[PDB]
């Protein structure tokens, strides 16, 4: 079901219902129709009408301060400013400012390890031991630009951390990039290696009982006794009687 | 005749040859003509569950009705596995029938290559040998239709509606001089402008009269049920300018046929319908007078809680099946009988166990139906009068509704084509029927030699001829109730309010209601649903659960 | 012919608010006696068309306006009760 | 099985045979027989070709069954493919496009492999706005759809069946949605009309299109207006007067946005200035670009303030059409007679800006104006002083309205009056007048 | 005698408060409750499967990862 643009850009194809920049009194001119990613970011220069402006993702609204600039120069301009606070001074690095993943606040109370967007990758430290999070150094199997829903930490040792709100569907074992001439060893990190997670979706229980096998001792009843005429006989007799069937009632009916 | 009591599936055949000898047993059979699942005695005081063609079991005979006996399906399968075991010689053939007993459609064996459809008594329906998965298997109209087809007889189609299973009115035509068949699988083809009506069919067919009849789910005929409708009276309707459709089912020459005939129907059986599963199987318990005889509880299903004579006692789903959790020997049981108030309970207990705050709790009779058709004046029509000389059975209208009109293509048609509402009756049953079958202008529009034998069932009421009460089957007749909801049922249709009834019947979506009877099973249930209550309400129910 | 219809009325369409630009005007220049007038003659217009006395003292007592003497509170609004329920509903 | 179908383009026929010596029911026991002693038959074929003189019967082997349409499953209620020539009648019982159950062993290697039918203009994935998933609801109960099964002939290029079906919606104007989903035999494509289910609230403007049972890929034609613009202003073809010269404007509903394309002060009749007073509507003839920026003046009425302002004269006889952008492509309009007073004192904002009713409703919104007062309704004796003047002239402006509504985008049948207070007397006299069906101004009434 | 206990059934994964069950995507096969990544002589292509399909011969890449069409290739370009 679709994100807080993929919704918008519907209703601006549809119907024209678009959206508007500056809020203040729009010519037809400064309206749009929201331009948007696979995932329902806002697609930094998107543009219609007037021109081309540059608007962050997760706010349809424009990161008023060439090239627009990057996500953490205007969180660092948005919290020293004091309008947005997630509760540190965010820290760029010298040139295209991504995130560097050493992540804290004021005093050094606990510094964590970031995804492209930002987010937490989840698991976290205190400034007594400071996070390695660095590059991979190996190449990711099967020409992958990045794994989706994750980053991968390293202190020259490197694993899958799965995004908050995933689980990895196999288990991230300790490997090894510890300068292995730039490659993996007996499992490699695959690509898409995490979903979302989802309900349960079956029920079932067991039960115990046993025959007590009349015609004196006999386990030589084995051919065709344990596949065939068993686990079959048991079986037509027990829905004849009526216990493979749950039958209750809606409502009367 | 005898195109069905010649392959009369002999359990029926060693009904009869036991009977007349009056005999202590007689065999039990089901409505197709198989041996039902447990064979009883007439005292009731040895009853035995019977392998498929009437040879019992080697061994089960309570005294008393069995709690449970194995399926047709799960006789055959434990056969042909320890034929495999004493002899040793494997089959790579074993059934994979389902929780009801009768066969899946589609079979095969373990390493599945080659899976078919199979009939639902047993036999392989030949041609669809398929490698590996049929994605729709024929039903029992659709293969009496083709091999009618390939030439066995009868030539005139048992039809059917959209899924191969019969309707339960069948009409074919037959030329009265030389009682044979009339073909039509040749007729509607080689003459399809002489369909348009009646009166342009009659003047192509001078000789044939139509014959309608009901028939079970089987397609063979109902034993004495089968009337000879007259045609030469019928007039034309506004429908002869459209189109004729694919086969003669959607034709307007055949659901004038079925209307004329569930009409008399009404007059004859109380029943607007011909009769269902329930109502043959309590006559033909009745006739033979052996034990188990079913309950019907006026709506054509079974009613709920079913005993026997003088014997246990259980409840039965709609289907004729029995539930497994309850057999009670003495008082009859009460199996959810209005007891609607437990699953309610757990409705309201896990609303109210969810989360906090309304954030959704609140978004959690149906929708638009106490607001179109019980509050605004629409339903007002039906259940109200002028005074109690009714009785109008609402197991009747809502039959009634189902059977003039049996879906929405007719509805949208019906009401397309109307300017006066008092000219509706004409183009719907190409007549002024009601009042011909009320006050029984109907000598002429109906004939002899149709099986229903008219002269001895107007001999126990005297009132007139052509030329208490027992029905078609073991029915109760207040003929004085039947023609006064007939006389009511024409002054529904001569009304503005009806047709503006019927707009918003079809704008009624699939899911809640399928036919139009289920809208007027929706709508006469929903005059008395009051606005749900406070959403954090829980009601009290009682020790078994009784509201 | 066919033309659906979506029709109705509010509750504040009276021929007084019908007439409130009418007032404003005749309050410009000043003219106290174009209101007691107007609604005399507006009660000479709600019975018929030819002002039947049959029909216009039968209507003003299932309104009850028969207090034209001292106050204009209870008879301006009951005359608009009746306007409303014969010019417009 | 008998396909639900009548019409087939892209056939590719194994082998014909006549069959007239025999009957329908042992001819067609014959037709059977003869596709079961093929090893690549898809189906056969049983009609009479040439119905048109009555002609014989066939059973024509077919090698694949390329395009299948005119379903006998939506009724006729919306057609945009052609159901056949009226030669062929697979239309009665035992004739039938008939098929073999589709089994997933297919045609052996030795039969002829078959091709689609070729597409004549060149489709381009550019002009066709793909949705998701997720911008849809199931509705089992919408009426005007049609569907075209493309068999599983062509197993692999789903992207050349996918170019098949939206060349057919690109070559029918009607068509604007189409939707194709695989399943176990073919590829179902559907087609649409513009089908939205709008969900307006104020803190969102949701949108979503209708359609019945769920395909995989959905694609649309974009959306176009007969409105040109030049320096972003407005403007339009008149039929012989030529262009208007309007106005836009973004308004906002909630928390969206949307461009309203006003075109303020249209007229249609001569201004009644002097000694054309108490005459006629006199229709105009103007031509060239008209000045429709701003709000006219409304009409005298009594109980007229003496401020000889510019929002009230006598010429009061101007409409203000509003147009959201993109429209649907036969829409719906809205009349609406109203004379307004002189509270507003020459704000440049019309009294009632009905733009938002056209808006939220995605419909065209004419707010009219009618002579009230002495300078209309004077009758006088039984002469050439008539008496309905303003009244007349509603009838002056509602054939101003579905003559010149094409250009704008709008549908002259689907139009509807309305009137506010008291006009709604006077307004209804319209609904009275039994005239011509084929010169019926309205269709519905407020 | 082990009463009743959630589980999930079809094709996915079973982690161990809430919607612990997983979809078991591409490159992978659900054989008995975990989905063991699809060998390297096939491959999968579409997430929540039991099996995974055959390439043409003599066709892979690297490894038991087999992600989707475009990685059963020859060895003209696994020449290196
Ligand atoms: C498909 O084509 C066949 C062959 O043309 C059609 O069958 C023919 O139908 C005509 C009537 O449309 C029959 O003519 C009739 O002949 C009898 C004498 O036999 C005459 O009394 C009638 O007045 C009329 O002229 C013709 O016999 C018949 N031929 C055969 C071989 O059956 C058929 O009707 C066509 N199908 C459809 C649905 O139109
Ligand atoms: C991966 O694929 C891209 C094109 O998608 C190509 O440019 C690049 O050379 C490939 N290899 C690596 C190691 O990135
Ligand atoms: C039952 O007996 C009949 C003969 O009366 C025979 O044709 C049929 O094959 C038998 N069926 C079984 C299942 O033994
Ligand atoms: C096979 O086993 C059956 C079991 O009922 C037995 O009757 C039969 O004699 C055996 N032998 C043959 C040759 O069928
Ligand atoms: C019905 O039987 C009579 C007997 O002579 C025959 O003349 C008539 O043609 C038959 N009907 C048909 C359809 O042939
Ligand atoms: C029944 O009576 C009506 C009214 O007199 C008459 O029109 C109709 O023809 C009668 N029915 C028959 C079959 O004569
Ligand atoms: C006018 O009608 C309203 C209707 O609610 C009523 O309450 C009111 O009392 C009426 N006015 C007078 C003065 O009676
Ligand atoms: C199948 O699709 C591809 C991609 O669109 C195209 O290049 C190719 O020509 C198509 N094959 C045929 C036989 O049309
Ligand atoms: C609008 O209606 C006209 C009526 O003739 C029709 O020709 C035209 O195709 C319709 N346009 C659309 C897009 O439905
Ligand atoms: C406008 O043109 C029409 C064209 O038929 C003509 O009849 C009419 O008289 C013209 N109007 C004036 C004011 O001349």
Same mark, same amino acid.
């Given at each position: 079901?679709?994100?807080?643009?993929?919704?918008?850009?519907?209703?601006?194809?549809?119907?024209?219902?678009?959206?508007?920049?500056?809020?203040?009194?729009?010519?037809?001119?400064?309206?749009?129709?929201?331009?948007?990613?696979?995932?329902?970011?806002?697609?930094?220069?998107?543009?219609?009408?007037?021109?081309?402006?540059?608007?962050?993702?997760?706010?349809?609204?424009?990161?008023?301060?060439?090239?627009?600039?990057?996500?953490?120069?205007?969180?660092?301009?948005?919290?020293?400013?004091?309008?947005?606070?997630?509760?540190?001074?965010?820290?760029?690095?010298?040139?295209?400012?991504?995130?560097?993943?050493?992540?804290?606040?004021?005093?050094?109370?606990?510094?964590?390890?970031?995804?492209?967007?930002?987010?937490?990758?989840?698991?976290?430290?205190?400034?007594?031991?400071?996070?390695?999070?660095?590059?991979? #150094?190996?190449?990711?199997?099967?020409?992958?630009?990045?794994?989706?829903?994750?980053?991968?930490?390293?202190?020259?040792?490197?694993?899958?951390?799965?995004?908050?709100?995933?689980?990895?569907?196999?288990?991230?074992?300790?490997?090894?990039?510890?300068?292995?001439?730039?490659?993996?060893?007996?499992?490699?990190?695959?690509?898409?290696?995490?979903?979302?997670?989802?309900?349960?979706?079956?029920?079932?229980?067991?039960?115990?009982?046993?025959?007590?096998?009349?015609?004196?001792?006999?386990?030589?009843?084995?051919?065709?006794?344990?596949?065939?005429?068993?686990?079959?006989?048991?079986?037509? &007799?027990?829905?004849?009687?009526?216990?493979?069937?749950?039958?209750?009632?809606?409502?009367?009916? | 005749?005898?195109?069905?009591?010649?392959?009369?599936?002999?359990?029926?055949?060693?009904?009869?040859?036991?009977?007349?000898?009056?005999?202590?047993?007689?065999?039990?059979?089901?409505?197709?003509?198989?041996?039902?699942?447990?064979?009883?005695?007439?005292?009731?005081?040895?009853?035995?569950?019977?392998?498929?063609?009437?040879?019992?079991?080697?061994?089960?005979? %309570?005294?008393?009705?069995?709690?449970?006996?194995?399926?047709?399906?799960?006789?055959?399968?434990?056969?042909?596995?320890?034929?495999?075991?004493?002899?040793?010689?494997?089959?790579?053939?074993?059934?994979?029938?389902?929780?009801?007993?009768?066969?899946?459609?589609?079979?095969?064996?373990?390493?599945?290559? /080659?899976?078919?459809?199979?009939?639902? &008594?047993?036999?392989?329906?030949?041609?669809?040998?398929?490698?590996?998965?049929?994605?729709?298997?024929?039903?029992?109209?659709?293969?009496?239709?083709?091999?009618?087809?390939?030439?066995?007889?009868?030539?005139?189609?048992?039809?059917?509606?959209?899924?191969?299973?019969?309707?339960?009115?069948?009409?074919?035509?037959?030329?009265?001089?030389?009682?044979?068949?009339?073909?039509?699988?040749?007729?509607?083809?080689?003459?399809?402008?002489?369909?348009?009506?009646?009166?342009?069919?009659?003047?192509?067919?001078?000789?044939?009269?139509?014959?309608?009849?009901?028939?079970?789910?089987?397609?063979?005929?109902?034993?004495?049920?089968?009337?000879?409708?007259?045609?030469?009276? =019928?007039?034309?309707?506004?429908?002869?300018?459209?189109?004729?459709?694919?086969?003669?089912?959607?034709?307007?020459?055949?659901?004038?046929?079925?209307?004329?005939?569930?009409?008399?129907?009404?007059?004859?059986?109380?029943?607007?319908?011909?009769?269902?599963?329930?109502?043959?199987?309590?006559?033909?318990?009745?006739?033979?007078?052996?034990?188990?005889?079913?309950?019907?509880?006026?709506?054509?299903?079974?009613?709920?809680?079913?005993?026997?004579?003088?014997?246990?006692?259980?409840?039965?789903?709609?289907?004729?099946?029995?539930?497994?959790?309850?057999?009670?020997? !003495?008082?009859?049981?009460?199996?959810?009988? !209005?007891?609607?108030?437990?699953?309610?309970?757990?409705?309201?207990?896990?609303?109210?166990?969810?989360?906090?705050?309304?954030?959704?709790?609140?978004?959690?009779?149906?929708?638009?139906?106490?607001?179109?058709?019980?509050?605004?004046?629409?339903? #007002?029509?039906?259940?109200?009068?002028?005074?109690?000389?009714?009785?109008?059975?609402?197991?009747?209208?809502?039959?009634?509704?189902?059977?003039?009109?049996?879906?929405?293509?007719?509805?949208?048609?019906?009401?397309?084509?109307?300017?006066?509402?008092?000219?509706?009756?004409?183009?719907?049953?190409?007549?002024?029927?009601?009042?011909?079958?009320?006050?029984?202008?109907?000598?002429?529009?109906?004939?002899?030699?149709?099986?229903?034998?008219?002269?001895?069932?107007?001999?126990?009421?005297?009132?007139?001829?052509?030329?208490?009460?027992?029905?078609?089957?073991?029915?109760?007749?207040?003929?004085?109730?039947?023609?006064?909801?007939?006389?009511?049922?024409?002054?529904?249709?001569?009304?503005?309010?009806?047709?503006?009834?019927?707009?918003?019947?079809?704008?009624?979506?699939?899911?809640?209601?399928?036919?139009?009877?289920?809208?007027? &099973?929706?709508?006469?249930?929903?005059?008395?649903?009051? %606005?749900?209550?406070?959403?954090?309400?829980?009601?009290?129910?009682?020790?078994? !659960?009784?509201? | 012919?066919?033309?659906?219809?979506?029709?109705?009325?509010?509750?504040?369409?009276?021929?007084?608010?019908?007439?409130?630009?009418?007032?404003?005007?005749?309050?410009?220049?000043?003219?106290?006696?174009?209101?007691?007038?107007?609604?005399?003659?507006?009660?000479?217009?709600? !019975?018929?068309?030819?002002?039947?006395?049959?029909?216009?003292?039968?209507?003003?007592?299932?309104?009850?306006?028969?207090?034209?003497?001292?106050?204009?509170?209870?008879?301006?609004?009951?005359?608009?009760?009746?306007?409303?329920?014969?010019?417009?509903? | 099985?008998?396909?639900?179908?009548?019409?087939?383009?892209?056939?590719? =026929?194994?082998?014909?045979?006549?069959?007239?010596?025999?009957?329908?029911?042992?001819?067609?026991?014959?037709?059977?027989? #003869?596709?079961?002693?093929?090893?690549?038959?898809?189906?056969?074929?049983?009609?009479?070709?040439? /119905?048109?003189?009555?002609?014989?019967?066939?059973?024509?082997?077919?090698?694949?069954?390329?395009?299948?349409?005119?379903?006998?499953?939506?009724?006729?209620?919306?057609?945009?493919?052609?159901?056949?020539?009226?030669?062929?009648?697979?239309?009665?019982?035992?004739?039938?496009?008939?098929?073999?159950?589709?089994?997933?062993?297919?045609?052996?290697?030795?039969?002829?492999?078959?091709?689609?039918?070729?597409?004549?203009?060149?489709?381009?994935?550019?002009?066709?706005?793909?949705?998701?998933?997720?911008?849809?609801?199931?509705?089992?109960?919408?009426?005007?759809?049609?569907?075209?099964?493309?068999?599983?002939?062509?197993?692999?290029?789903?992207?050349?069946?996918?170019?098949?079906?939206?060349?057919?919606?690109?070559?029918?104007?009607?068509?604007?949605?189409?939707?194709?989903?695989?399943?176990?035999?073919?590829?179902?494509?559907?087609?649409?009309?513009?089908?939205?289910?709008?969900?307006?609230?104020?803190?969102? /403007?949701?949108?979503?299109?209708?359609?019945?049972?769920?395909?995989?890929?959905?694609?649309?034609?974009?959306?176009?207006?007969?409105?040109?613009?030049?320096?972003?202003?407005?403007?339009?073809?008149?039929?012989?007067?030529?262009?208007?010269?309007?106005?836009?404007?973004?308004?906002?509903?909630?928390?969206?946005?949307?461009?309203?394309?006003?075109?303020?002060?249209?007229?249609?009749?001569?201004?009644?200035?002097?000694?054309?007073?108490?005459?006629?509507?006199?229709?105009?003839?103007?031509?060239?670009?008209?000045?429709?920026?701003?709000?006219?003046?409304?009409?005298?009425?009594?109980?007229?303030?003496?401020?000889?302002?510019?929002?009230?004269?006598?010429?009061?006889?101007?409409?203000?059409?509003?147009?959201?952008?993109?429209?649907?492509?036969?829409?719906?309009?809205?009349?609406?007679?109203?004379?307004?007073?002189?509270?507003?004192?020459?704000?440049?904002?019309?009294?009632?800006?009905?733009?938002?009713?056209?808006?939220?409703?995605?419909?065209?919104?004419?707010?009219?104006?009618?002579?009230?007062?002495?300078?209309?309704?004077?009758?006088?004796?039984?002469? &050439?002083?008539?008496?309905?003047?303003?009244?007349?002239?509603?009838?002056?402006?509602?054939?101003?309205?579905?003559?010149?509504? #094409?250009?704008?985008?709008?549908?002259?049948?689907?139009?509807?009056?309305?009137?506010?207070?008291?006009?709604?007397?006077?307004?209804?006299?319209?609904?009275?007048?039994?005239?011509?069906?084929?010169? %019926?101004?309205?269709?519905?009434?407020? | 005698?082990?009463?009743?206990?959630?589980?999930?059934?079809?094709?996915?994964?079973?982690?161990?408060?809430?919607?612990?069950?997983?979809?078991?995507?591409?490159?992978?096969?659900?054989?008995?409750?975990?989905?063991?990544?699809?060998?390297?002589?096939?491959?999968?292509?579409?997430?929540?499967?039991?099996?995974?399909?055959?390439?043409?011969?003599?066709?892979?890449?690297?490894?038991?990862?087999?992600?989707?069409?475009?990685?059963?290739?020859?060895?003209? /370009?696994?020449?290196?």
């Amino acid at each position: 079901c679709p994100t807080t643009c993929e919704k918008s850009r519907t209703s601006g194809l549809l119907s024209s219902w678009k959206q508007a920049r500056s809020q203040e009194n729009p010519s037809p001119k400064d309206l749009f129709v929201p331009a948007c990613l696979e995932t329902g970011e806002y697609a930094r220069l998107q543009a219609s009408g007037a021109g081309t402006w540059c608007v962050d993702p997760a706010s349809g609204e424009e990161l008023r301060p060439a090239q627009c600039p990057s996500l953490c120069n205007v969180l660092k301009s948005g919290v020293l400013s004091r309008r947005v606070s997630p509760g540190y001074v965010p820290a760029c690095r010298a040139e295209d400012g991504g995130f560097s993943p050493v992540q804290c606040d004021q005093a050094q109370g606990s510094c964590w390890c970031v995804m492209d967007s930002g987010e937490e990758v989840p698991g976290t430290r205190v400034t007594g031991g400071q996070p390695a999070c660095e590059s991979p #150094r190996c190449p990711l199997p099967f020409n992958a630009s990045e794994v989706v829903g994750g980053t991968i930490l390293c202190e020259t040792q490197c694993q899958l951390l799965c995004r908050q709100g995933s689980w990895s569907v196999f288990p991230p074992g300790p490997l090894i990039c510890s300068l292995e001439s730039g490659r993996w060893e007996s499992q490699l990190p695959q690509p898409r290696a995490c979903q979302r997670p989802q309900l349960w979706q079956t029920i079932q229980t067991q039960g115990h009982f046993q025959l007590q096998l009349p015609p004196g001792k006999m386990c030589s009843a084995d051919y065709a006794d344990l596949l065939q005429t068993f686990q079959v006989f048991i079986l037509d &007799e027990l829905t004849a009687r009526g216990f493979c069937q749950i039958q209750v009632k809606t409502f009367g009916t | 005749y005898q195109v069905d009591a010649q392959p009369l599936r002999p359990c029926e055949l060693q009904r009869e040859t036991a009977f007349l000898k009056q005999a202590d047993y007689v065999p039990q059979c089901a409505e197709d003509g198989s041996f039902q699942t447990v064979q009883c005695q007439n005292d009731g005081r040895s009853c035995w569950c019977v392998g498929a063609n009437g040879s019992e079991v080697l061994g089960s005979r %309570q005294p008393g009705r069995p709690v449970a006996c194995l399926s047709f399906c799960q006789l055959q399968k434990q056969q042909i596995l320890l034929s495999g075991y004493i002899n040793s010689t494997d089959t790579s053939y074993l059934p994979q029938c389902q929780d009801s007993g009768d066969y899946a459609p589609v079979q095969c064996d373990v390493q599945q290559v /080659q899976c078919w459809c199979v009939d639902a &008594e047993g036999m392989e329906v030949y041609g669809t040998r398929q490698l590996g998965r049929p994605k729709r298997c024929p039903r029992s109209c659709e293969i009496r239709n083709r091999r009618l087809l390939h030439g066995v007889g009868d030539k005139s189609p048992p039809q059917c509606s959209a899924e191969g299973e019969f309707m339960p009115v069948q009409c074919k035509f037959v030329n009265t001089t030389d009682m044979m068949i009339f073909d039509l699988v040749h007729s509607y083809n080689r003459f399809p402008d002489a369909f348009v009506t009646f009166s342009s069919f009659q003047r192509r067919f001078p000789e044939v009269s139509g014959y309608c009849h009901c028939a079970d789910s089987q397609g063979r005929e109902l034993a004495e049920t089968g009337l000879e409708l007259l045609l030469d009276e =019928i007039y034309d309707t506004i429908f002869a300018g459209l189109d004729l459709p694919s086969t003669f089912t959607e034709t307007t020459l055949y659901r004038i046929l079925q209307r004329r005939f569930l009409a008399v129907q009404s007059v004859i059986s109380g029943r607007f319908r011909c009769p269902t599963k329930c109502e043959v199987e309590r006559f033909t318990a009745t006739s033979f007078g052996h034990p188990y005889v079913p309950s019907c509880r006026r709506n054509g299903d079974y009613q709920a809680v079913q005993c026997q004579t003088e014997g246990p006692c259980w409840c039965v789903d709609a289907q004729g099946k029995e539930m497994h959790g309850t057999r009670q020997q !003495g008082e009859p049981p009460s199996c959810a009988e !209005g007891q609607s108030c437990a699953s309610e309970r757990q409705q309201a207990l896990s609303r109210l166990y969810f989360g906090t705050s309304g954030y959704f709790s609140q978004h959690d009779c149906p929708p638009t139906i106490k607001e179109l058709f019980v509050d605004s004046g629409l339903l #007002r029509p039906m259940v109200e009068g002028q005074s109690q000389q009714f009785s109008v059975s609402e197991n009747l209208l809502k039959e009634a509704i189902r059977a003039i009109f049996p879906s929405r293509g007719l509805a949208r048609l019906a009401l397309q084509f109307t300017t006066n509402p008092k000219r509706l009756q004409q183009n719907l049953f190409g007549g002024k029927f009601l009042v011909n079958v009320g006050q029984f202008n109907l000598s002429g529009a109906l004939g002899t030699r149709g099986t229903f034998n008219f002269s001895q069932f107007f001999q126990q009421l005297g009132l007139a001829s052509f030329l208490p009460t027992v029905g078609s089957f073991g029915f109760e007749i207040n003929l004085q109730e039947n023609q006064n909801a007939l006389k009511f049922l024409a002054s529904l249709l001569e009304l503005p309010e009806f047709l503006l009834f019927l707009q918003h019947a079809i704008s009624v979506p699939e899911d809640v209601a399928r036919d139009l009877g289920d809208v007027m &099973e929706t709508v006469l249930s929903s005059q008395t649903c009051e %606005q749900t209550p406070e959403r954090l309400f829980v009601p009290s129910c009682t020790t078994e !659960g009784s509201y | 012919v066919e033309v659906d219809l979506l029709i109705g009325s509010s509750q504040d369409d009276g021929l007084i608010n019908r007439a409130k630009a009418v007032k404003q005007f005749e309050e410009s220049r000043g003219r106290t006696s174009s209101k007691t007038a107007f609604y005399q003659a507006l009660q000479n217009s709600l !019975g018929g068309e030819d002002s039947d006395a049959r029909v216009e003292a039968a209507a003003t007592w299932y309104y009850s306006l028969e207090h034209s003497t001292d106050d204009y509170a209870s008879f301006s609004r009951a005359l608009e009760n009746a306007t409303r329920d014969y010019f417009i509903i | 099985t008998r396909l639900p179908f009548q019409k087939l383009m892209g056939i590719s =026929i194994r082998n014909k045979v006549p069959m007239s010596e025999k009957s329908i029911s042992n001819g067609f026991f014959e037709c059977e027989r #003869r596709c079961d002693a093929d090893p690549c038959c898809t189906g056969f074929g049983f009609l009479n070709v040439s /119905q048109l003189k009555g002609g014989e019967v066939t059973c024509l082997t077919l090698n694949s069954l390329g395009i299948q349409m005119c379903s006998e499953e939506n009724g006729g209620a919306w057609r945009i493919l052609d159901c056949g020539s009226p030669d062929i009648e697979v239309h009665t019982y035992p004739f039938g496009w008939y098929q073999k159950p589709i089994a997933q062993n297919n045609a052996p290697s030795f039969c002829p492999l078959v091709v689609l039918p070729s597409l004549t203009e060149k489709v381009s994935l550019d002009s066709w706005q793909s949705l998701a998933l997720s911008s849809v609801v199931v509705d089992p109960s919408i009426r005007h759809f049609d569907v075209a099964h493309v068999s599983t002939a062509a197993t692999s290029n789903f992207s050349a069946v996918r170019d098949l079906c939206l060349s057919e919606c690109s070559q029918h104007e009607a068509c604007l949605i189409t939707t194709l989903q695989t399943q176990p035999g073919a590829v179902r494509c559907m087609f649409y009309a513009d089908t939205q289910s709008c969900t307006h609230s104020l803190q969102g /403007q949701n949108c979503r299109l209708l359609l019945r049972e769920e395909a995989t890929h959905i694609y649309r034609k974009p959306g176009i207006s007969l409105l040109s613009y030049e320096a972003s202003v407005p403007s339009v073809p008149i039929s012989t007067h030529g262009r208007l010269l309007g106005r836009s404007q973004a308004i906002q509903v909630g928390t969206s946005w949307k461009q309203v394309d006003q075109f303020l002060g249209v007229p249609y009749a001569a201004p009644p200035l002097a000694e054309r007073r108490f005459q006629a509507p006199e229709p105009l003839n103007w031509t060239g670009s008209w000045d429709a920026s701003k709000p006219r003046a409304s009409c005298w009425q009594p109980g007229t303030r003496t401020s000889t302002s510019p929002g009230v004269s006598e010429d009061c006889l101007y409409l203000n059409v509003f147009i959201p952008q993109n429209v649907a492509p036969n829409a719906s309009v809205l009349v609406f007679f109203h004379n307004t007073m002189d509270r507003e004192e020459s704000e440049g904002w019309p009294a009632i800006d009905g733009s938002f009713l056209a808006a939220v409703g995605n419909l065209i919104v004419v707010t009219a104006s009618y002579r009230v007062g002495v300078f209309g309704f004077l009758s006088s004796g039984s002469g &050439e002083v008539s008496g309905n003047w303003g009244l007349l002239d509603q009838v002056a402006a509602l054939t101003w309205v579905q003559t010149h509504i #094409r250009g704008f985008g709008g549908d002259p049948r689907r139009v509807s009056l309305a009137a506010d207070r008291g006009g709604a007397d006077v307004a209804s006299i319209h609904l009275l007048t039994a005239r011509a069906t084929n010169s %019926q101004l309205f269709r519905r009434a407020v | 005698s082990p009463r009743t206990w959630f589980g999930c059934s079809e094709g996915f994964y079973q982690v161990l408060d809430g919607l612990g069950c997983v979809k078991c995507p591409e490159g992978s096969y659900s054989q008995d409750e975990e989905c063991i990544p699809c060998p390297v002589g096939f491959y999968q292509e579409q997430a929540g499967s039991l099996a995974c399909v055959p390439c043409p011969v003599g066709r892979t890449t690297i490894s038991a990862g087999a992600f989707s069409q475009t990685h059963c290739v020859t060895d003209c /370009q696994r020449n290196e």
